[PDB]
Amino acid sequence: GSSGSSGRLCKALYSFQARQDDELNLEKGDIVIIHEKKEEGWWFGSLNGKKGHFPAAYVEELPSNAGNTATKASGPSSG
Template sequence: GSSGSSGLLARALYDNCPDCSDELAFSRGDILTILEQHVPESEGWWKCLLHGRQGLAPANRLQILSGPSSG
């Protein structure tokens, strides 16, 4: 177990239908875990985790959730 995982969460603002297998498919309102915000080959894309799958998601379709939401 890794006890230092500080993964940012982001909410999807729009649906995303991927064109290639590297992209994540998600729907508006989905909550993604951001793994990497600086992807060298893909500027403007974040590596994210959703439903156990890793892939790229367009940053302009995501909104970072700030801080822990209580209730």
């Protein structure tokens, strides 16, 4: 599609409650951007704009994102 293929994606099967800021909170059916997974189960990525350490067993790697998330705004010569 678009020049990329750098970060992987995944869906949170079970909602995770990040005890502290160290970990990352996940919600049932949440797409997280896989940044780095150089750990056993402990994955690293951003959910909704916030990065952190979340479990793998909770999320599941996906081949492609879900449907198509986009919006249409207007401004000073937006496009």
